[PDB]
Structure 1
Amino acid sequence: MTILFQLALAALVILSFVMVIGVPVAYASPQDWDRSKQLIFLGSGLWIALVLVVGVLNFFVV
């Protein structure tokens, strides 16, 4: 269960970094806005999901 927690949190941090760099780059990029838009939706959903998972798993490792 702890493995799941640290997995999800490391994932959350990484994804956060990726989004931090990628979202403004995408927003200001001329080309490939459709796939980028899709990926921002995806990354956002996954980001919210990971926050909820880390949030729940918190109470099973602390």
Structure 2
Amino acid sequence: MVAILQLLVSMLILLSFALVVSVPVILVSPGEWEKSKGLVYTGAGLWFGLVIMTAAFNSFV
């Protein structure tokens, strides 16, 4: 029950790092945000879902 939470929050850290690196780059770059606008939405939604899941699995630990 603890290893699952640790893996989940490690995935959350990795996704937060990826979003921090990508989102300003995607938005500022004139080439991006047209062919890859939905990628930002999917990444942010996955980030919030990971946050909710970590909050859930914290209760059982």
Taking the TM superposition and a 5 Å limit, the aligned residue runs for 1:18-33 are: 18-33=18-33
Once the two structures are TM-superposed, the CA of residue 30 in structure 1 deviates from its matched residue by 1.4
Taking structure 1 as the reference length, the TM-score comes to: 0.88
Q: Which runs of 5+ in 2 are unaligned?
A: none
Taking the TM superposition and a 5 Å limit, the aligned residue runs for 1:11-50 are: 11-50=11-50
Distance 2:26 2:15 in 1: 15
> What stretches of structure 1 move > 4 A for 4+ residues in a row?
none
Deviations 1:12-59 (A, max 9, x none): 111001111100000011113234211100001100000000001001
Percent of aligned pairs sharing the same letter: 43
Q: Which runs of 5+ in 1 are unaligned?
A: none
Q: Secondary structure at the match of 2:34?
A: helix
2:44 partner letter = S
